């Protein structure tokens, strides 16, 4: 499309009391790589990360115009946001631009502040919600990562096994795509802590 | 909405709203302005400080542009609405004409913003008066004064607001060319004029100078106390002409 113009990958993955969301880092104008570090993962409160891949402009508008709705909701109401609502809230924001859409596809990783239930989901560029329990992917290498995760996953993993899986699942799916790669970062969220490791990928 | 006529003609042939806004000026604070040859000094009397306020947020001498500063006396609320639109104007003019604003022009626009408000529906007059002060593109000094009516004249010296009828009576006799011949004599002329209408000495007169092609400096309180010592020293060496 024109969501290929910049490239990008994101990927969420449920554990059993943890959730891990991983992304590539590479802001490139067609084939030419400009910068090697360009964040596609944003904090949305604690234990809630939205991952936006696709057109690098809307990646930045939609994380700014989504922070503006979120903050104006954690103040007006004292509660802190639920992961199921941050899905419905970012659905409505895309569908607001129905004709002449944004060109991002959100991925939401996160835990329920009041328990620690894990929760992931992706969306279409027009704002359709898709809750899964395996893993959700979006990007230009989507089909690369679907195949790679369908046979590299397990129904329950601990925080050390998850980070093993998604790591070796991102590295191999993003290396088979031209316009992605050059540095993977992985958040992995427990109830306790938020560990964030960068993987050593092929800089070509 | 709210299309009413606030300002209508009296039967006596006045406009009572623009004459009442004249009183909201008189309940203001004194501000003076003398223009030298390389320096223009406007001082506002009363910082209004109560040993608890900051001196950084009570200021009554703002700066529209780089060569243009403005002091006011009236409703602090209204003044901030004018000053804003003035600062916008001062940049809108740099875009469409390369030169910076002259001091006449940013005035004619502050005045013409105040005149339209006394002849439009819904609005009360702006209750401020202003000294616009600055230097042109030729180093010339200028001093303009507006009022709610939306008229403006230049002056050589002038005072607005509270106690301004008295201060104009002191500047008629004291503004000559035996004074304002140096930068030190022009600052001392302003302070000597506010000392006639301040009842707490010199530690109550905020005073800002502008100098040729440099930008607006506000004199910190130490320099003003030094100048107030030279005044009071000079009224004890007038005892050499009484003996």
């Amino acid at each position: 499309s024109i969501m290929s113009y910049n490239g990008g990958a994101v990927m969420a993955m449920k554990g059993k009391n943890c959730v891990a969301i991983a992304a590539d880092r590479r802001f490139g104008i067609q084939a030419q790589m400009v910068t090697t570090d360009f964040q596609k993962i944003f904090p949305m409160g604690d234990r809630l990360y939205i991952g936006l891949a696709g057109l690098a402009t809307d990646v930045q508008t939609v994380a700014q115009r989504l922070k503006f709705r979120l903050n104006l909701y954690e103040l007006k109401e004292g509660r802190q946001i639920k992961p199921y609502t941050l899905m419905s809230m970012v659905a409505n924001l895309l569908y607001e631009k129905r004709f002449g859409p944004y060109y991002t596809e959100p991925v939401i990783a996160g835990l329920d502040p009041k328990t620690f239930k894990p929760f992931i989901c992706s969306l279409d560029l027009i704002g359709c919600p898709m809750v899964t329990d395996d893993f959700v992917v979006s990007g230009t290498c989507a089909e690369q990562m679907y195949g790679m995760c369908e046979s590299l996953w397990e129904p329950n993993m601990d925080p050390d096994h998850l980070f093993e899986t998604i790591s070796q699942a991102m590295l191999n799916a993003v290396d088979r795509d031209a316009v992605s790669g050059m540095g993977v970062i992985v958040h992995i969220i427990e109830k306790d802590k938020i560990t964030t490791r960068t993987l050593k990928a092929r800089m070509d | 909405s709210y299309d009413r006529a606030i300002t209508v003609f009296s039967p006596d042939g006045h406009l009572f709203q623009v004459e009442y806004a004249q009183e909201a000026v008189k309940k203001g604070s004194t501000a003076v302005g003398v223009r030298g040859r390389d320096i223009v000094v406007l001082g506002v009397e009363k910082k209004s400080v109560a040993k608890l306020q900051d001196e950084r947020t009570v200021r009554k001498i703002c700066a529209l542009d780089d060569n243009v500063c403005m002091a006011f006396a009236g409703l602090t609320a209204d003044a901030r609405i004018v000053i804003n639109r003035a600062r916008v104007e001062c940049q809108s003019h740099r875009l469409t004409v390369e030169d910076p604003v002259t001091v006449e022009y940013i005035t004619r626009y502050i005045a013409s913003l105040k005149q339209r408000y006394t002849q439009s529906n819904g609005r009360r007059p702006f209750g401020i008066s202003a000294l616009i002060v600055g230097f042109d593109f030729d180093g010339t000094p200028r001093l303009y004064q507006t009022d709610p009516s939306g008229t403006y004249h230049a002056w050589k010296a002038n005072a607005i607001g509270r106690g301004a009828k008295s201060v104009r009576e002191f500047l008629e006799k004291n503004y000559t060319d035996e004074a304002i011949e140096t930068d030190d004599l022009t600052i001392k002329l302003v302070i000597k004029a506010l000392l006639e209408v301040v009842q707490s000495g010199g530690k109550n007169i905020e005073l800002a100078v502008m100098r040729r092609d440099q930008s607006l400096k506000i004199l910190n309180p130490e320099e003003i106390e030094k100048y107030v010592a030279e005044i009071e020293k000079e009224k004890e060496e007038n005892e050499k002409k009484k003996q």
């Binding site: 109401e77 509660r79 199921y84 609502t85 419905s88 409505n92 | 909405s1 709210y2 009413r4």
Partner: protein, 233 residues
């Protein structure tokens, strides 16, 4: 036809008062008594129904409305102004439910309904609303009881009264309200504190009760109220 006035009719007086809201609070105090009692697993909203013959059909109108699956209202004061606020609330709830796919929390709904009533003390050519809403709701595990005033303010209560003789009823409740009640008195004790201001004989079609537990708000059928009116339940 017309344009509409543009100038507010609520104005400050030399006192520092907004006389119009002061008066609209006196209309509130003419209205039919209403009590509210937060329990510890439900909220009870009971109200003295209006009638003055046997010709009225006491099931064609309701002073206890449902705003959402988890919200309720009763009011005290002018009956036309109540159908306007019940109808702007039900729409607020539906915009909220249309954007977050989640029933509107009860703290939220009262804070918005209040800002509509605040808009009519500072808008052109209107008078304030002539009612006090008592909003119950049960979200997030808890019960809630609020009350918005024609001013626009709102206060969370643990139990209160409004309308006629709401100073006698707030005293009566002050003693009889000891937390950790069961849901079923708040009904009993509520009905009692309507009786401290009601002259005549209460019946199943003469008061209206609504509860509000985890299962959701619901108006009590006439049969149901007749039983609590054993004055022993």
């Amino acid at each position: 036809a017309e344009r509409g006035y543009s100038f507010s009719l609520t104005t400050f007086s030399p006192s520092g008062k907004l006389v119009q809201i002061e008066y609209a609070l006196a209309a509130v105090a003419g209205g039919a008594p209403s009590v509210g009692i937060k329990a510890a697993n439900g909220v009870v909203l009971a109200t003295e129904k209006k009638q003055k013959s046997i010709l009225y059909d006491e099931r064609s109108v309701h002073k206890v409305e449902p705003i959402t699956k988890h919200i309720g209202l009763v009011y005290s004061g002018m009956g036309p102004d109540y159908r306007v606020l019940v109808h702007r609330a039900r729409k607020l709830a539906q915009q909220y439910y249309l954007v977050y796919q989640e029933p509107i929390p009860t703290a939220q709904l009262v804070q918005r309904v209040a800002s509509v009533m605040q808009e009519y003390t500072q808008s052109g050519g209107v008078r304030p609303f002539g009612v006090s809403l008592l909003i119950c709701g049960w979200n997030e595990g808890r019960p809630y009881l609020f009350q918005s005033d024609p001013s626009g303010a709102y206060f969370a209560w643990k139990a209160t009264a409004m309308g006629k003789n709401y100073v006698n009823g707030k005293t009566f409740l002050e003693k009889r309200y000891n937390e950790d009640l069961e849901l079923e008195d708040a009904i009993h004790t509520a009905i009692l504190t309507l009786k401290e201001s009601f002259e005549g004989q209460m019946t199943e079609d003469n008061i209206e009760v609504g509860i509000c537990n985890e299962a959701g708000f619901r108006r009590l059928t006439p049969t149901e109220v007749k039983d609590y009116l054993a004055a022993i339940a």
